[PDB]
Nucleic acid binder design. Structure first.
Length: 17
RNA sequence: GGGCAGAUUGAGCCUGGGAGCUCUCUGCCC
């Protein structure tokens, strides 16, 4: 902990199909 | 598609200072 240079995770994201 | 939670003892980026961003996997919810 006590650090930076990251964000909250995701479920899924966009794609071509 | 999106949110919330878990993997940075998963990958990448910019920056002096992220309540930061891109990218992937899993669970729950819409």
């Amino acid at each position: 902990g006590i650090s930076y240079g990251r964000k909250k995770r995701r479920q899924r994201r966009r794609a071509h199909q």
